[PDB]
């Protein structure tokens, strides 16, 4: 029910929850010409 409240002490269960959440949705199928990038060149995947 409440991650950040109950498991407010252990900082690894929260990261596990976040990883499971981001790796839960099917990636959309859209290749585009100009998208978001970072300084090095990696493209951004999602928004939180």
């Amino acid at each position: 029910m409440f991650f950040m409240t109950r498991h407010a002490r252990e900082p690894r269960l929260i990261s596990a929850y976040l990883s499971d959440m981001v790796s839960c949705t099917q990636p959309s199928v859209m290749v585009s010409r100009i998208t978001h990038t970072n300084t090095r060149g990696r493209q951004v995947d999602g928004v939180l």
Binding site: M30, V31, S32
Partner: peptide, 27 residues
């Protein structure tokens, strides 16, 4: 500017599982 990728194909001998068996063709 924005397209859709269709038919993500896949081969077998590039997978990696093709090191437990010796596959070979025969007519």
């Amino acid at each position: 500017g924005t397209y859709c990728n269709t038919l993500n194909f896949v081969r077998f001998l590039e997978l990696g599982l093709s090191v437990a068996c010796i596959c070979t063709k025969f007519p």
